[PDB]
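During the second half of the funding period, the structural biology subgroup turned its attention to how the target accommodates small molecules. The most pressing case was adenosine-5'-diphosphate, which had performed well in the primary screen but for which no bound structure existed. We therefore specified the complex as follows and requested a full 3D prediction, including the ligand pose.
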Amino acid sequence: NSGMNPIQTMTEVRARQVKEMNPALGIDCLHKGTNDMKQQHVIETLIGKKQQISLATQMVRMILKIDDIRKPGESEE
Amino acid sequence: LSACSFTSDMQILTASGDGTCALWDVESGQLLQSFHVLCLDLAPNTFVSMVWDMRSGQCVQAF
Amino acid sequence: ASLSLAPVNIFKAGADEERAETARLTSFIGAIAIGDLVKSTLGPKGMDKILLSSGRDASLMVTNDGATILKNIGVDNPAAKVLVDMSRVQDDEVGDGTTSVTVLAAELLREAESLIAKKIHPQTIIAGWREATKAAREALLSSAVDHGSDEVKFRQDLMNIAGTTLSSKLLTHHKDHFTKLAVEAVLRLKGSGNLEAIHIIKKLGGSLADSYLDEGFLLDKKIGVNQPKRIENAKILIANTGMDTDKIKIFGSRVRVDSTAKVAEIEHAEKEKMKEKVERILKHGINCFINRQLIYNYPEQLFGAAGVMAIEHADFAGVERLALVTGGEIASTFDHPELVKLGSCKLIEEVMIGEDKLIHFSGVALGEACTIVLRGATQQILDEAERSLHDALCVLAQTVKDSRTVYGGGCSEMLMAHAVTQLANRTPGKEAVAMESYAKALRMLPTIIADNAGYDSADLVAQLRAAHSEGNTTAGLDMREGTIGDMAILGITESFQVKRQVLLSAAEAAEVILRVDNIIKAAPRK
Amino acid sequence: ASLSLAPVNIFKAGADEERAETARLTSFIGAIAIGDLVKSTLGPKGMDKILLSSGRDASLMVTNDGATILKNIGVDNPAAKVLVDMSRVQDDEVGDGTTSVTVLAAELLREAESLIAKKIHPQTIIAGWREATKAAREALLSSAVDHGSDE
Amino acid sequence: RGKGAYQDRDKPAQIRFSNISAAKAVADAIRTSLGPKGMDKMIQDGKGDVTI
Amino acid sequence: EGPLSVFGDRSTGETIRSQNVMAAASIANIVKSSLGPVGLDKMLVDDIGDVTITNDGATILKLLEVEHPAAKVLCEL
Amino acid sequence: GEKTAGINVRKGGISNILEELVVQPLLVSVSALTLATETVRSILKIDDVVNT
Amino acid sequence: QVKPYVEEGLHPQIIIRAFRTATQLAVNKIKEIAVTVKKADKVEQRKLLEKCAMTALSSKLISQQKAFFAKMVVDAVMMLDDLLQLKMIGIKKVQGGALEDSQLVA
Amino acid sequence: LLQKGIHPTIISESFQKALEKGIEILTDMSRPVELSDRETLLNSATTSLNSK
Ligand SMILES: Nc1ncnc2c1ncn2[C@@H]1O[C@H](COP(=O)(O)OP(=O)(O)O)[C@@H](O)[C@H]1O
Ligand SMILES: Nc1ncnc2c1ncn2[C@@H]1O[C@H](COP(=O)(O)OP(=O)(O)O)[C@@H](O)[C@H]1O
Ligand SMILES: [Mg+2]
């Protein structure tokens, strides 16, 4: 969405996160020069991320568990 | 198939909505030459659909 | 009062007319739509289009050729029809440039609608465009370089031109191999312009790199039953005779006797006439016999008993190509054996290509006729390769005819546009604005070329403009990495004829469409 | 893959969806149509329009006001609806400048269409326009003159 | 540097995705008939002709 | 219909196997009553009143109007 | 290190496939690879569909 | 299983009698071999209830949290007095939230 | 590959390189045969006929 190359930027940020232990390195969407989100003050609630992961996992589990559909197929008006 | 004007019984002129008439012969059964259609009138070695010539395989008179 | 907007109606049911603003809107919309469609297939990084026929056959066609794309589309906009006819005529005149001329015309008409919106009379635009076309044409002619005197430099120019022509097409995967292929095929013509002397055979299966130019010739016909399947030091006789129950051409003649014994005698006389004809043919001292028409069973048996190959039903193109490649004479009477020249080749045999058997002529005498075998993975790939080779051969033949060459990669467009801008800076009035719009379209051409590659077109075009204004007359786009460079060293060259024709045809069509202020449509049949 | 260009049909009957280039095309076409319609009624030498209603009473209305022109027409393009609501709100805030604001928005969107055609991400255009708006507002404020003290 | 080319046109990506989806669908359809444990298919034409 | 994009129906897996078995069983049950000395003949009206009384299996299966290919296989057998 | 190992349907696992005499000419695999790669490359160059 | 015998003209009454006999024998065998423990202590009784609840729940989308829900169900049922009305166990569904956020209120 | 933001031309060139390497690998795997070796021909035909 910010116009940068996805795979290269994500790989570089992941490599930087692995090299020096800093879980605050993200994608410089606004092109401020730095990749440290702690300095850029990009902050989200922990509850938000936990809820995102939980809800996505549960809904994906439901969608994966459905193996049959019985629609009326009437194409009613 | 639209036009199947059997001809000189040695040759067969056939045509359809394809738009390119085909010249066949009875004995050999080989397409002699496909001239690049609804009517296949012959000479009242030449025929008109555009007049075509057997000897050259090309349109000779357009009207 | 308008013709249609009047209290009384003056038209039949279904007839229509569009006045100045509406006609201009329709024409500009149609032309810009055509230009946008045909573009993005331009330059080395242009992509291909899929043409799904809606007919009964539902023919599928993938291609990069602008003329092919514009031909097989249902067009209702009349200005779009004008542009399509422009592309077709450009294809007929020279092989390449079909996409470039259409894009140039579309950009010119877009600038024209901008100028009209700026309250400029279209006649002033036309005059300014005429002056700009004159200046650009003279500048391009001054920029042309000729290498026809030097054989090695001319061969290098042919290499570069074939490579530039094949760069955009699907053959860019094996550009080097296909460039050598096309250059050899054209050079084997010995200066003749007969593009029909080069036969392209499309055989499914195999890789695209397996395509090759046969050192001799290949015929897709069959040999007789009892005739030999292999001849060394062949003596060709090419004929266009009956060889099939050839009735005496007196159509009013008939056999009228009173006994079946006489009928049998006449039948034996007919067979003896055929036998004597075959003997007269054999008196030439030949090993192979190619006839344009069919050969029936009796002459075939006689030829087999004589140990002579009798290739039958080789159509007009086939006999012409055989005559060109072997040096024979297409005869129709055999009463003067000494006055007829016989073709020659070292070996004739049958070759196995894919699953079909073909006749191979090897060690030909003249060889002024080529057979190019195309192997591909799909029918669509084979068709596109055939189209690309046709474009390359056409451009190479045009270059052989006229050896003047100009640099590609946007260099010619930059130089012509720089000349147009220089002229405009010396011109007072709105003609200067029209000239500037003309130059803007000329810049827009390589701008679209760079856009298709994903590069930063604005910076590259600005650099090209600065270099051309400074005096670097050979600067152009370097598509290898996305910079600008010298087109002379990089060997990006194209025919002067092609570029001049593109420029002139685009200017003509833009002027013709711009002159229109009213479109009147008669009631259609449907 | 998009919702419309998917092998499965994911929408109700009569509902559609327009992706990036198509949505931009429709928005720009609607905005330019609104701007071209409302203009020519601008400045001292502007001309008036005739609003002939299609209703049973067929109300006839001659007008030069941009807001009245824009509100009394059948608008289906959503961007055109946005421009119409802009004109109505402008009329509500102050009695003048409806045609001016509509034409300015249309011209801005035309230039945006040109910039998008020149391969520029719309966020860059938006940031540049925010900076330009700041500069223009500051200049206009600095150019203002007040005469309320002297009667 | 910042952002690169915007690529305002999304139709080429949709065309590529549709082509890939169709090819993958064909491959999945004929996947079941591969190998010594593969099984044949019966196809009935519009004319009513049947082939296995 | 779906990503396969073929103009026709498609049955896969246990469904087509069951359909084939059903067709074969239908053909078998047509002629099952005409087996052995305690078998009985059959009448075959030919849509215009023509009557064919037979016990031969080949005649019965040839005179019948069958449409399922798995049943045409048994008839040709 | 063993390259002649493949699916063994008779045994039900993995074994030296040459012991089951399951061999095929190299031309089949080479042609399959070359033709599939060429078709994929051709498809990747397509970015628009036009209805005639 | 009885379809092939039906097709060959077996009388339905014989099949019915055989089914009744087999069902009676199977029910008696189930009652004979069913495991019960005569100790009447609360701890292992709760363990038995929890194990039965986990087995009943290990087929649904909440199977990943079957221990948590099983413990909650056992507590909820044990808080019922003597008749175990279903209407005495309220079930409120509130949209939004993970499964582990489900709670039982005393 | 395309979803990650890779241009189709790069994908096609990489696939061509992979195809060349794969042809080399397959050629390295294979072993020569003689048409006088009847057992090899029989095994090839049988391998062809297992799936039918
Ligand atoms: N290798 C290359 N480098 C830079 N530009 C090229 C190259 N090959 C072709 N071009 C440019 O692409 C333009 C379009 O060529 P092409 O699309 O092949 O045929 P057409 O001229 O019919 O559009 C030409 O004007 C040429 O200057
Ligand atoms: N006498 C004038 N001389 C020059 N410009 C004028 C004059 N009167 C009005 N204008 C300009 O015409 C513009 C449009 O005003 P108008 O046509 O009344 O519609 P609106 O005020 O709704 O935009 C205004 O911005 C104003 O600057
Ligand atoms: Mg070209």
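Two results from this model are relevant to the next phase. The pocket of adenosine-5'-diphosphate (ligand 2) is lined by residues D 42-44, 46, 66, 96-100 (CB under 6 Å). Chain I has two helices and no strands.
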